[PDB]
Amino acid sequence: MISLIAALAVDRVIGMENAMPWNLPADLAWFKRNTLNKPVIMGRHTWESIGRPLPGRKNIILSSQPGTDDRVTWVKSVDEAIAACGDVPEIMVIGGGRVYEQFLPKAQKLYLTHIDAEVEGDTHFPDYEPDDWESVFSEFHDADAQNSHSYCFEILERR
Numbered sequence: 001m002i003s004l005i006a007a008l009a010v011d012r013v014i015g016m017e018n019a020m021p022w023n024l025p026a027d028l029a030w031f032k033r034n035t036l037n038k039p040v041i042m043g044r045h046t047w048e049s050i051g052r053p054l055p056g057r058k059n060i061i062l063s064s065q066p067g068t069d070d071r072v073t074w075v076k077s078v079d080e081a082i083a084a085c086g087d088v089p090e091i092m093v094i095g096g097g098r099v100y101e102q103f104l105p106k107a108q109k110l111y112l113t114h115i116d117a118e119v120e121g122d123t124h125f126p127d128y129e130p131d132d133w134e135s136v137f138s139e140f141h142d143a144d145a146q147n148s149h150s151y152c153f154e155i156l157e158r159r
């Protein structure tokens, strides 16, 4: 099965100038929890924004160009990316915008964090049809001393 995981600010903004302007340790812990010991697929720009391999995960990078780092796996198409994951129960697609758009039609599950932040971005999560999805988990958290915005963890499954 293919799953997308993403954190969305207001108006589905997910990035600006190849960074995530906010800082929510609780959300990154949620990301780690849900991706550890699974393959993660990302686009080249997201790979460059993270800046190093994610430990405890098979890192698969999509690029039309040859690889530049043998600590991770490089692939040249969506189908190759999926194949490189091997026979696993769950493949995690971790962005960015252009990668999300391509994998969304193939995905069975969305792990979404809705962040109460107004950020002017240049990258958005794709505009998905709500009728195709059912919410099976929702958990809201107020801002605290560590997390500067309120946020909601949601898991959607394709109906």
Ligand SMILES: NC(=O)c1ccc[n+]([C@@H]2O[C@H](COP(=O)([O-])OP(=O)(O)OC[C@H]3O[C@@H](n4cnc5c(N)ncnc54)[C@H](OP(=O)(O)O)[C@@H]3O)[C@@H](O)[C@H]2O)c1
Pocket: 005, 006, 007, 008, 013, 014, 015, 016, 017, 018, 019, 020, 042, 043, 044, 045, 046, 047, 049, 062, 063, 064, 065, 075, 076, 077, 078, 094, 095, 096, 097, 098, 099, 100, 102, 123
């Ligand atoms: N808030 C979140 O949850 C979240 C998560 C991830 C990323 N981001 C943010 O999203 C932004 C980056 O997203 P982005 O849309 O600009 O770029 P991206 O999706 O991360 O990567 C785009 C690149 O992936 C490569 N590639 C993509 N699709 C391919 C395909 N079908 N076949 C072969 N190669 C392919 C291309 O690399 P080449 O040009 O080398 O061919 C393309 O330029 C950043 O701001 C980042 O911080 C946010």
Ligand SMILES: Nc1nc(=O)c2nc(CNc3ccc(C(=O)N[C@@H](CCC(=O)O)C(=O)O)cc3)cnc2[nH]1
Pocket: 005, 006, 007, 020, 025, 027, 028, 029, 030, 031, 032, 046, 049, 050, 054, 055, 094, 095, 112, 113
């Ligand atoms: N929900 C969600 N939040 C995110 O911020 C997020 N970010 C990306 C891509 N960007 C990044 C940037 C940094 C790290 C990162 O340093 N992760 C650490 C967490 C460290 C910790 O647990 O405190 C990791 O090991 O996973 C991951 C993804 C993709 N999906 C996401 N999904």
Ligand SMILES: [Mn+2]
Pocket: 158, 159
């Ligand atoms: Mn059903």
